[PDB]
Design a protein that fits this description.
Blueprint: E1 18-26, E2 31-37, E3 46-53, H1 59-74, E4 83-89, E5 92-98, H2 105-112, H3 117-136, E6 149-151, E7 157-159, H4 187-190, H5 198-213, H6 223-232, H7 243-252, H8 269-272, H9 282-286
Antiparallel strand pairs: 1-2, 2-3, 3-5, 4-5, 6-7
Helix pairs in contact: 3-5
Bound molecules: the ligand COc1cc(Nc2nc3cccc(-c4c(F)cccc4OC)c3o2)cc(OC)c1OC.
Binding site for ATP: 24-32, 50
Domain Protein kinase: 18-277
Family: Belongs to the protein kinase superfamily. AGC Ser/Thr protein kinase family. S6 kinase subfamily.
Length: 302
């Protein structure tokens, strides 16, 4: 067949269609900005714009930005951020995502020091459904940390940053990269022996421990000491934690990933049916029908 030398025409989304309002923070590979759509059907809509600079030279950040885009296009879940646009210019990549009005969980955690078990149960329950959705698509999230847990105006969670995630992890395939925040890494991630979706359940345990106590379970004076402390996994259990919380933590903190809660044949069901989550109606939770525990004039002349 002879090639028809003609070009398809399309009106392309450009960064000029989004008014820059302020810098929201720093994502895995670039800055995130609050922007407002100028034109089209979604005019006046607020979004979060993630920008990757000098994209042509930053080859590893570029391949992961493309993977992040691909993950976001594939996912359809209540607790996972929606991607609205993805486009590029010379040396710049852009992702236009939902703007989460409630800020991140780290800001709330730092202000409160620690959360009640009722609050932790809520956050982890929505997170377990989001993680399981990613696992069903062959994805390892890998970058759990409270900075990556965003809240909407209602107080429900959203996972938003997939820059450090891993795709195509199914059957006997393992990932070997050493990326993410060290304090949340599973032992198999730290010792470079290969990791799968079960590494996310160790991270889920770290996040749980931090939310309940205000501190990290395995941490040393520097990143190298934290690494060897994760490999030893000698956990000092705070005595204000309930028996249900202590059971879940010990079942998640299994150094052998094959023996970790959520790694058995029932997958996420092993976590969903744990006593710590016994008051959770998982169907109502997925339907966003569970009230979040936290939701993020003087003149008088009658
Ligand atoms: C990180 O701090 C804030 C973030 C938001 N909202 C928000 N929606 C987002 C959608 C995608 C990404 C981010 C994000 C970000 F904006 C900065 C750093 C990391 C991020 O995600 C892990 C998002 O952040 C909203 C805020 O206040 C209303 C924040 O406090 C300044």
């Amino acid at each position: 067949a002879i090639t028809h030398h003609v070009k398809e025409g399309h009106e392309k989304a450009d960064p000029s269609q989004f008014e820059l309002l302020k810098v929201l923070g720093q994502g895995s590979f670039g800055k995130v900005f609050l922007v407002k759509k100028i034109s089209g059907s979604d005019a006046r809509q607020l979004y979060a714009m993630k920008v990757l600079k000098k994209a042509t030279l930053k080859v590893r950040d570029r391949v992961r930005t493309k993977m992040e885009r691909d993950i976001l296009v594939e996912v359809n879940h209540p607790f996972i951020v929606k991607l609205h646009y993805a486009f590029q210019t010379e040396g710049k990549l852009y992702l236009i995502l939902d703007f989460l009005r409630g800020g991140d969980l780290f800001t709330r955690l730092s202000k409160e020091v620690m959360f009640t078990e009722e609050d932790v149960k809520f956050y982890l329950a929505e997170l377990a459904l989001a993680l399981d959705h990613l696992h069903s698509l062959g994805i390892i999230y890998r970058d759990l940390k409270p900075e990556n847990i965003l809240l909407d105006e209602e107080g429900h969670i959203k996972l938003t940053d997939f820059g450090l995630s891993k795709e195509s992890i199914d059957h006997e395939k393992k990932a070997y990269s050493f990326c993410g925040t060290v304090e949340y890494m599973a032992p198999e991630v730290v010792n470079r022996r290969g990791h799968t979706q079960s590494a996310d359940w160790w991270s889920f345990g770290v996040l749980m421990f931090e939310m309940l106590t205000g501190t990290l379970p395995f941490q040393g004076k520097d990143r190298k000491e934290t690494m060897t402390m994760i490999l030893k996994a000698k956990l000092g259990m705070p005595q204000f934690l309930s028996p249900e919380a202590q059971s879940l933590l010990r079942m998640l903190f299994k150094r052998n990933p094959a023996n970790r809660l959520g790694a058995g044949p029932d997958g996420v069901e092993e976590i969903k049916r744990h006593s710590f989550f016994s008051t959770i109606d998982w169907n109502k939770l997925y339907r966003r029908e569970i009230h979040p525990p936290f939701k993020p004039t003087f003149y008088f002349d009658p």
